[PDB]
Write a protein that binds this DNA or RNA. Structure first.
Length: 64
DNA sequence: GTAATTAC
DNA sequence: GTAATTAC
């Protein structure tokens, strides 16, 4: 599952297996991902997020 | 400006 | 401390 989005003017594609953290800001889904060493950031409208990313968010909200 | 949270 | 994300 690839999440596609634009950040700082660059179109990006990141596989959900590289996503490190996911959270909700307002009605947007924001996240960090591994980029071979550095950590990237991205965010999409909840309506453009693939179910797999939303599932990752829901699981995060339940974690102890 | 704030929201959540980060890289920078 | 700020810029970035979608949305208000």
């Amino acid at each position: 599952v690839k999440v596609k989005f634009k950040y700082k003017g660059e179109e990006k594609e990141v596989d959900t297996s590289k996503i490190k953290k996911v959270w909700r800001v307002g009605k947007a889904v924001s996240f960090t991902y591994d980029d071979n060493g550095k950590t990237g950031r991205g965010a999409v409208s909840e309506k453009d997020a693939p179910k797999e990313l939303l599932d990752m968010l829901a699981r995060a909200e339940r974690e102890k």
